[PDB]
Amino acid sequence: MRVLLIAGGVSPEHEVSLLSAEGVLRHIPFPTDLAVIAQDGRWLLGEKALTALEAKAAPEGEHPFPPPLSWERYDVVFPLLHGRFGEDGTVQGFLELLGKPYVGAGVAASALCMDKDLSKRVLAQAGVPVVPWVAVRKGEPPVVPFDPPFFVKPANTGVGISRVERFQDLEAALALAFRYDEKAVVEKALSPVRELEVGVLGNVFGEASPVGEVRAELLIPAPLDPGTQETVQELALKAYKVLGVRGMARVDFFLAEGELYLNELNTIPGFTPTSMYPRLFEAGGVAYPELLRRLVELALTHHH
Amino acid sequence: MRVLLIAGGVSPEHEVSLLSAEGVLRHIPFPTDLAVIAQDGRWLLGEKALTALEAKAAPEGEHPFPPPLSWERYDVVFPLLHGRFGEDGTVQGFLELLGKPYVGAGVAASALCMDKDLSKRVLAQAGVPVVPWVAVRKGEPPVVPFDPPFFVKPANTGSSVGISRVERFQDLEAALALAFRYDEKAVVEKALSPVRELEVGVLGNVFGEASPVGEVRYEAPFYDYETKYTPGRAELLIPAPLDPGTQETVQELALKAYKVLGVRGMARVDFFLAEGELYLNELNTIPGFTPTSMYPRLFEAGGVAYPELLRRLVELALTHHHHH
Ligand SMILES: Nc1ncnc2c1ncn2[C@@H]1O[C@H](COP(=O)(O)OP(=O)(O)O)[C@@H](O)[C@H]1O
Ligand SMILES: [K+]
Ligand SMILES: [Mg+2]
């Protein structure tokens, strides 16, 4: 079985995407070719991709989309792209039309988990705790029922984020966010707050890894009481199932005043050997080569 | 200025899509080329695409995806595909990576509006009244929180394909198996009867304008496939016979759901009216443009002639891409 690895991308996470590709290529137990999307959207195949990998940045590519890629020569595609044109369902839709099995969530789950507003609406309706938030659309004035501090983020970008401490500064933060997305979210900023992260693996019905914490060091496992550790994993699996995520997801939480809040589901998390998602499943008995093998196997299982 | 019209698809609504292409091609006020996705997934271009149209069905195609199209010839793509692979964000995602302006909703809104489970979760959270429902996975034991009669559907479907009305729990397993033939996730809704079916068209990007409210009448048990497209079988009341407050409320809820889901271009929003209570049934981001179709007739009743509706759909696509 041969695997195609697509990395880079036009998003600001182009570099960290290439760093994830280097770690995967160094440990995947399959023959794996690399294909790079340069920052200008054009593709690099063959040796120019590896050259772009070693340079850690591909500013300009060769082939405009769609690329002259021998799709039939690969059994599984691993979209290792972060952010826009990576985790938002566009590349997934292309692969769906190519008929190629691919790692990770499908079009609907990728687009939903990328939308900071619509994902919370789904999660809140399912009974999953999330931080109080409001959507603001460009032009329409904002209606914020809570008090500062807020976070003002572009809803679909995954840059333009501001921590607003005075209501006076809200119009400036919305103006900054609106130049990257027509819809913005305003989230109540919790403080003090701890960040917890847990990995899920599987198709719709996943298994949870141990919980980790970001304090920038990675506490693995996170120093959590037995009850809180369980609720984090339970809440992650529920959210994973409600959104219909496939393959994998890193589910980030907030812990404040003893309350858990689902922060974000990442369908293509950072994947260096030292990244949180591989380290969490390593702590759970799933080593990095085995983790990559299972992700490929799950891509084929869904494809029947 | 040149529009590429894409019709057909590998969804069950393939033949419905070719009918809509004929209606759009007849009145579109732009130079428009047709491309057809045959039922095997392979594309027909140029003269073969037009021949596939007169056949009213395209079983086999020539070019595998992606097709050898000169995308730089076309300023706007009009995906006139219904259902899976066309209305659910997959084709939209391809057009996004191509950098080409296209008519209709984006990736997220298309995928969300094609999922009868997730869409209702968003609408119910935003306070939009919906029918009580439950989702069921393939091979997962069904737990129906209410009592029959039911409507069992695949979560991703169109033109009433795979939908069953259930009156006994013994008939539920057979209704779910029929639904699982078209989707791995099913929905089980509480059947409303008697029910009136109200439909209203929306036009615009996120902040839309509503058409007059129309109504669907028929003698069949429900608005099924044969009723929807066999001419004369379903009768369209345009505008619908309603109180002023009722037509107003339908339009307000249509625009509200349209805005929450971030729909672009167009949508036909369908409602249930039962015992004085309204219920939003579903949103359709690529509605029909065929002779028995409600969307263009509603805007025609509202003063927007068929060529003008298609002109604004194309211009809205250009506005979003180049200016947002
Ligand atoms: N809860 C319900 N109560 C009454 N009729 C229903 C209900 N759900 C579906 N129907 C009937 O089934 C038809 C199609 O349902 P819908 O959810 O729109 O599926 P599709 O998207 O395939 O059209 C509707 O026109 C309606 O007549
Ligand atoms: K729909
Ligand atoms: Mg439908």
UniProtKB/Swiss-Prot annotation, chain B:
Reactions catalysed, as given in the entry: 2 D-alanine + ATP = D-alanyl-D-alanine + ADP + phosphate + H(+)
InterPro entries given in the database record: ATP-grasp, ATP_grasp_subdomain_1, D-Ala_lig_Van_CS, D_ala_D_ala, Dala_Dala_lig_C, Dala_Dala_lig_N, PreATP-grasp_dom_sf
Protein keywords: ATP-binding, Cell shape, Cell wall biogenesis/degradation, Cytoplasm, Ligase, Magnesium, Manganese, Metal-binding, Nucleotide-binding, Peptidoglycan synthesis
Pathway: Cell wall biogenesis; peptidoglycan biosynthesis
Co-factor binding comment: Binds 2 magnesium or manganese ions per subunit.
GO biological process assignments: cell wall organization; peptidoglycan biosynthetic process; regulation of cell shape
Chain positions recorded as Mg(2+) 1 binding sites: D270, E282
Amino-acid positions noted as binding Mg(2+) 2 in the UniProt annotation, renumbered to this chain: E282, N284
Cofactor requirement: Mg(2+); Mn(2+)
Binding site for ATP: 147-198
GO molecular-function term, one example from the UniProt record: metal ion binding
ATP-grasp domain sequence ranges: 120-315
PANTHER family according to UniProt: D-ALANINE--D-ALANINE LIGASE, D-ALANINE--D-ALANINE LIGASE A
Purpose of the protein: Cell wall formation.
Similarity comment text for this entry: Belongs to the D-alanine--D-alanine ligase family.
Designated name of the protein: D-alanine--D-alanine ligase
Source organism of this protein record: Thermus thermophilus (strain ATCC 27634 / DSM 579 / HB8)
Lineage: Bacteria, Thermotogati, Deinococcota, Deinococci, Thermales
Gene: ddl
